[PDB]
Write a protein that binds this ligand. Structure first.
Ligand code: QNN
Ligand code: QNN
Ligand code: QNN
Ligand code: QNN
Ligand code: QNN
Ligand code: QNN
Ligand code: ZN
Ligand code: ZN
Lengths: 194, 194
DNA sequence: CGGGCATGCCCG
DNA sequence: CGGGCATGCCCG
């Protein structure tokens, strides 16, 4: 009955985890992940790679879904969408999250919650310990009429073809002009005032 | 043959001038006019009163047209429009400038230049030295996908019913959250660095 | 209200 | 590139 998808971490029986590349905090890095904050800082319309780690191999037909929700309680019931400017300038223009480099991407609009998601087949790592998906976020967190400075969580779910939830993980995202600057500011604020 | 409307001041044979109320520079004033900069600072979707002064009375049927153009050479050929966010949230939604409080307003989209303008009948001052029109600017200068931080000029023309230009004046506009702050900053910069 | 944090971006 | 100006707005 809830229209708000769950965000609670569920590593599940396959030992599903996410992982992220190390990139550092130079002012101009295109993306950078903060383990302390469990938060990706990235630039709009640029690659944001996410690694899928599993302990046990999921069954054939498993899918990987990504969906954004607002992190703050007061905004969690509002659907996360592209702002009108970037909508106008495969993926429907209203979708915030895209996957690049995949021939089997599917973009979904839920008929009951109206929430957007993007799904690709799960592929096991090559003869490697993880699989990488290249996500793109098509608005800045600050975009007026879209995210409007509100932080989001991206929820990644591993689902079998029957729709069973096999695993769930999430991470906070800030899409911004200067990921390295902003990661440094938020980590310093965590240390001084968190 | 030009698609860029003239901005050159033409006081003309009726002695046409604009005038503005004095309001000062408190951080929260809703609008404030800088004589030194010939520039109105105002807030979006709030009243921006403009006075029409004439020495001689225009003929019956005279009209008052307002149009925005970009002030900087590199942007002057681009039509000034409402941004997509405020377009979606009598006046066509794409028009930046509205007139409030007038039963005879007309909104025009030029069939050749595609430029927008808003026109009201000229009314002589009451048995007073000027007539006031209440304009509204429906985007901030900073709106993404609209003015995008580019300064505009508003061009006010006094036209007879046959279309003769009787007079023309213009003023720069900044639509912003804090007119009083921003007028003070720009006047100080004029003094220190202009 | 006024102080000052925010965050895209600097081109007259 | 990194410094710092910009400019809406501060609500976990
Ligand atoms: C943002 C992205 C990059 O450009 C490399 C470093 C960090 N992340 C993975 C690869
Ligand atoms: C973050 C900062 C940089 O280092 C370049 C990209 C965006 N911003 C301006 C230049
Ligand atoms: C912006 C507007 C106001 O609110 C009064 C002072 C200045 N201007 C005219 C009236
Ligand atoms: C300019 C400043 C003010 O004084 C109020 C209006 C907008 N901004 C925040 C509050
Ligand atoms: C998990 C991830 C790594 O750490 C490298 C790059 C691709 N996968 C295998 C080797
Ligand atoms: C010109 C203008 C003024 O200065 C006041 C207000 C209205 N008009 C007449 C009196
Ligand atoms: Zn956007
Ligand atoms: Zn706007």
């Amino acid at each position: 009955s809830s229209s708000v998808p769950s965000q609670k971490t569920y590593q599940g029986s396959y030992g599903f985890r996410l992982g992220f590349l190390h990139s550092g905090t130079a002012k101009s890095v295109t993306c950078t992940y903060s383990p302390a904050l469990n938060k990706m800082f990235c630039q709009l319309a640029k690659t944001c790679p996410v690694q899928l780690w599993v302990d046990s191999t999921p069954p054939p037909g498993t899918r990987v879904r990504a969906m954004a929700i607002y992190k703050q309680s007061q905004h969690m019931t509002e659907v996360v969408r592209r702002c009108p400017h970037h909508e106008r300038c495969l993926a429907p223009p209203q979708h915030l999250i895209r996957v690049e480099g995949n021939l089997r991407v599917e973009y979904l609009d839920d008929r009951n919650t109206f929430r957007h998601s993007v799904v690709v087949p799960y592929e096991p790592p090559e003869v490697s310990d993880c699989t990488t998906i290249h996500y793109n976020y098509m608005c800045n967190s600050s975009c007026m009429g879209g995210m409007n400075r509100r932080p989001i969580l991206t929820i990644i779910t591993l689902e079998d073809s029957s729709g069973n939830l096999l695993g769930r993980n999430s991470f906070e995202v800030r899409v911004c002009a200067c990921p390295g600057r902003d990661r440094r500011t938020e980590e310093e604020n965590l240390r001084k005032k968190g």
